[PDB]
């Protein structure tokens, strides 16, 4: 898809489905999640938190989880203090039992160093009545930190 | 090993960890087979046109490379247990949110590693398997580097 950020470029993985529909939404829950992926490039925790239920949680799995909407917003705002989401490409999206799975590459740029990295992520979303009750992203933190020279554990 | 606790964030939908399709059933059977630590048993599940990647490490393409890459992991690690909290699927992809209890043979240490994986199935055979997780957290937990 077009990322409207000319300094970024995402290559198609050899293993990624070529089908137009592979990363296209087939259900209402998948559509809301792709809408949320599109919103991530705002880098605005106060806009993004509107997608979440009060009883919710967030975890970038190499780092500790945040429970409840206030903590999720605070945690997302903290990440946006040091990183910009420049682009998101979702190669595969699927869903079952109220969970949505996204296999993606996020182009992330470390604001303190100016360096960016194309990060392989597999994430899961739990939705209750169209609102996010859980979001967990799985990926390797070290390879990101080393590419952008930004340790994130503390 | 001791019982693997359900995470606080796990779904309480009683079907979340159950297979709903024949492909999901195959993937759960494959998860059961992992504790064999036996690449020759595991490769029976794979198509000739296939791939495997533990995402922090380089991929293996084709059934022969996949078997040899899994056998190589088994030279240093035992899979002592696998607990699949969530399984779902769409469009021939099966997703598994899991904890794998992995033990490093050189150190004897074990860690309950959080993993999200995707499997591609064609005609009941695995044509792709990619696991996403934090490699450093595992390496530091069991005192076993896997990426120099
Ligand atoms: O794009 C959404 C994520 C994100 C990135 C940047 C700012 C907010 C949110 C959530 C988890 N994802 C992985 C990640 C977390 C922490 C550090 C590095 C990677 C990326
Ligand atoms: O349990 C199946 C996996 C596995 C583990 C151990 C031996 C063979 C296979 C497949 C890759 N998975 C990710 C992984 C790779 C290397 C180190 C830690 C995690 C785990
Ligand atoms: Na689709
Ligand atoms: Na299920
Ligand atoms: Na589905």
Residue numbers in the entry:
A (entry chain B): -4 to 149
B (entry chain A): 2 to 149
What does the paper say about this structure?
To further elucidate the mechanism, crystallographic experiments were performed. We obtained the complex crystals of SZ611-substrate 59 and SZ611-product 46 using the soaking methods as described in Material and Methods. SZ611 assembles into a homodimer structure with four α-helices and five-strand β-sheets in each monomer, forming a cavity that serves as a deep substrate-binding pocket, in which a substituent of substrate 59 or of product 46 can occur without steric repulsion. In contrast, product 46 was well-defined in the electron density map, including the phenyl group corresponding to that of substrate 59. The phenyl group is located in the hydrophobic local space formed by the hydrophobic residues of L71, L74 and F75, which were clearly defined in the electron density map. Two other essential mutations, Y53F and N55A, have well-defined electron density maps that together expand the hydrophobic local space, thereby leading to the preference of intramolecular cyclization reactions. The molecular architecture of substrate 46 in the binding pocket was mainly attributed to its multiple interactions with catalytic residues D101 and D132. Product 46 shares a similar conformation with substrate 59 considering the hydrogen-bonding networks of amines and hydroxyl groups with D132 and D101, which together predicts a pathway for the LEH-catalyzed selective desymmetrization reactions of oxetanes. In the catalytic reactions, residue D132 acts as a proton acceptor to promote the deprotonation of the amino group. The deprotonated N-atom then nucleophilically attacks the oxetane moiety, resulting in ring opening, followed by the protonation of the O-atom of the oxetane precursor with D101 as the proton donor.
We report an in silico strategy for the biocatalytic synthesis of chiral N- and O-heterocycles via Baldwin cyclization modes of hydroxy- and amino-substituted epoxides and oxetanes using the limonene epoxide hydrolase from Rhodococcus erythropolis. We turned to cofactor-independent limonene epoxide hydrolases (LEHs) that normally catalyze direct hydrolysis of epoxides by positioning and activating water at the active site. On the basis of the well-documented mechanism of ReLEH, a water molecular is positioned by H-bonds to N55 and Y53 while D132 abstracts a proton from the water, enabling a smooth nucleophilic attack on one of the substrate’s epoxide carbon center. We have rationally engineered the epoxide hydrolase ReLEH with construction of a general platform for Baldwin cyclization reactivity of hydroxy- and amino-epoxides and oxetanes.
